[PDB]
Design a protein around this nucleic acid. Sequence first.
DNA 1: GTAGACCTGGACG
DNA 2: CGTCCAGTCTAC
Length: 288
Amino acid sequence: PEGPEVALTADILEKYFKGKTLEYIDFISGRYSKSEPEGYDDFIANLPLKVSNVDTKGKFLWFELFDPNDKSNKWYIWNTFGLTGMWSLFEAKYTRAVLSFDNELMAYFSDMRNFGTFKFSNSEKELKRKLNELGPDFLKNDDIDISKIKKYKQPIVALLMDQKKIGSGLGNYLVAEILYRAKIDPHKLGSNLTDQEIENLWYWIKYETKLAYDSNHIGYMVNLENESSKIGRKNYHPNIHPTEKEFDFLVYRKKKDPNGNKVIADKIIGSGKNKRTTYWAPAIQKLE
DNA sequence: GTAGACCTGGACG
DNA sequence: CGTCCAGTCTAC
């Protein structure tokens, strides 16, 4: 669940559930079966509700609902995928939440590690502040000012993994692939990047996110792979055209890049128990 | 900057 | 068996 997976998932959810009426939501296992989500009791007390939209910003997804007869009464379902969260049209393994729509329609959210989150709110004010905590969506926003990179004396890989400083949506596999394509050493500080490197990086961020979004089976939303190939793709970053028809890992979790160059599995980011692995090829990515 | 935790495996020896 | 590896928040 990196930006592209969450965006595609929302598009599929919109295809199958926009305009549908939600009658009930149940947490059959995981964290929310042990302790209910924030705002759950009030939400259930207000069902049924019609789904007006399903949107995303970076890795954050949310459902917007309302009472047909009371268009003022607007509710939101906040959802975070974590590391293994997945939505599906069938009750897959690790199903945690079951959404019951009218006419027997069903939607399921499964999450093996249970790192995903759910929150219910009928406050648009709160949702807005939540969205403001996230930087511009790297996939959906075509006019981001990444030149802001230069203001940070931090490793470029850290700045890109951050969901607020420059933009939102990039995760561990996307950043590794983007820096390799841009030929930039992960350790390189944003403050040391040239304007030439900046515009180059921006190019690849768009290329990689769009390629990922257009893919049908990268592997992090397997429960909807059949649906992925039965729905189109919004034309984000209209001017960018990836040559490959399916996203492929050039360095992430690889022993060597496509040309035999050694791939290092570096521990640049995090500390203690939150250390992430950054894959890069020293022969290709340099500090220039 | 450094450490841990949330929670459940898969892959490997 | 055991040992790594696999988004985000909290605390000294």
